[PDB]
């Protein structure tokens, strides 16, 4: 009698990658792969997830909020994980801005970058005492104050001069003004209007030159007088003029320089920000809680160590992307059944 060692033969439809034996069929396998499927986003587990930059600051754009629109002046919750729903964020009211002429639209998302952002304890520069003639803090219809009347972005002052006379460029110095080693985000721009209204609001009807410097970054603009594009992302018909608005970014202890003439929107309430919230691109009516947020697959929770599919930015507790569906052998190599004996 002969007693021998043997191995099994059985259903071996699963194939595996080996170095020495090429690719082989195997009894069974533990898969390490999944393809996730597109779904709605969710609040990231061990954190808090940014929505409209300001919840509780209802019915407003992040851009609106950013710009310090009258009503939209609510308070910002800190988070360590932010989502970007607007690649091109919009304004939903207030004074007509010619958005597409400045990096401005991105301001909400720049802010989103940070863990902590705040409106401002104080305003940077004294609106009236500013270089140039004494200014009436221009107040504008079509930007309803809460009561009403003339509400103008806390962000900046509508610098209208008594003693209406043309100006040779002036320089305001926007200092640091932020607690801690916070990032300061300054904001500003210029109003310009039609021939007649120009002369009326400021004694001049001439294109106006504006130049800002901040940390070696310099920008120069020239105002427009007549024939402005249709107003959009606003309210109703002070079609008279438009605002060109920009942001300036100030690192801890750095100063800024705005040269200006007439139409100047001097900075006022100015963002202080600090810390780094992790940002991702997500289409967002946030629903529930997931382990992990995938730019594409969206809300997703961790089943297997890897996933296959479209690679993308993903934050949290995420499975690792992998080229191709991987499998771990949990069985033995296929062996054809034996009568190969005597």
């Amino acid at each position: 009698d002969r007693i021998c060692t043997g191995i099994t033969s059985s259903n071996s439809p699963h194939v595996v990658k080996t170095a020495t034996q090429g690719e082989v069929n195997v009894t069974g396998v533990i898969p390490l792969t999944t393809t996730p499927t597109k779904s709605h986003f969710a609040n990231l587990k061990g954190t808090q997830t940014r929505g409209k930059l300001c919840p509780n600051c209802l019915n407003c754009t992040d851009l609106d909020v950013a710009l310090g629109r009258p009503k939209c002046m609510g308070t910002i919750p800190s988070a360590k994980a932010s989502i970007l729903h607007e690649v091109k964020p919009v304004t939903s009211g207030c004074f007509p801005i010619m958005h597409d002429r400045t990096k401005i639209r991105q301001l909400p998302n720049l802010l989103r970058g940070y863990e902590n952002i705040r409106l401002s304890a104080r305003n940077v520069t004294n609106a009236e005492t500013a270089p140039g003639g004494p200014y009436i803090v221009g107040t504008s219809g079509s930007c309803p104050n809460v009561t009403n009347g003339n509400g103008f972005f806390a962000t900046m002052a509508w610098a209208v001069p008594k003693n209406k006379t043309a100006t040779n460029p002036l320089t305001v110095e926007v200092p640091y003004i932020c607690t801690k080693g916070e990032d300061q985000i300054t904001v500003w721009g210029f109003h310009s209007d039609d021939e007649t209204q120009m002369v009326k609001l400021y004694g001049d009807s001439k294109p106006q030159k504006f130049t800002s410097s901040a940390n070696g970054v310099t920008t120069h603009y020239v105002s427009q007088i007549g024939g402005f594009p249709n107003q959009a992302e606003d309210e109703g018909l002070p079609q008279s003029g438009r605002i060109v608005v920009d942001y300036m970014v100030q690192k801890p202890g750095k100063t800024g320089t705005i040269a200006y003439q007439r139409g100047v929107l001097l900075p006022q309430k100015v963002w202080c920000a600090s810390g780094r919230s992790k940002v991702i691109k997500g289409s967002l009516p946030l629903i529930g809680e997931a382990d992990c947020l995938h730019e594409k697959y969206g809300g997703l929770n961790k089943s297997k160590p890897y996933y296959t599919g479209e690679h993308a930015k993903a934050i949290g507790n995420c499975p690792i992307w992998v080229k191709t569906p991987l499998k771990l052998a949990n069985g033995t190599k296929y062996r054809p059944p034996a009568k190969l004996l005597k």
Binding site: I3, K323, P336, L340
Partner: protein, 169 residues
Amino acid sequence: GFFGAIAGFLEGGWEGMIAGWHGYTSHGAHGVAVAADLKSTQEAINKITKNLNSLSELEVKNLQRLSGAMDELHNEILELDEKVDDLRADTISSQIELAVLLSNEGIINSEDEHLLALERKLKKMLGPSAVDIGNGCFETKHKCNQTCLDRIAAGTFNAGEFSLPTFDS
């Protein structure tokens, strides 16, 4: 594998072996007996389990958007950032691909070392009157049908049940 082909083992499946991966076959007047070993199949499943836990531990930094990028101003920087993400992903993927494959090679090959052990466990219990062929088989001075072999598979076998000499641990 390479060991099994050279030292004339048998590239034979025993589709009889249901309850386990490796065990013993038994040959004679009774025909052919087959039995799984429920420790070699268990010890193999262990390694694999612990190997999974091994592959799972790996952590790789999140990989996310750029804090101060800015999506219309900084496109060229933003573009290099994608390159970065792509490369990172493609790199860490090839690495994992390697880790697993190595891991599989390990498991697949180790199978022969099970067989080899299982043989030596057998040699003990068959006593000094058996004859080690080298085949992975033993010529035994007594008959072994299904029942006998099942004791062999369980470790409750005793030579001298057919009055023959016995090693006693």
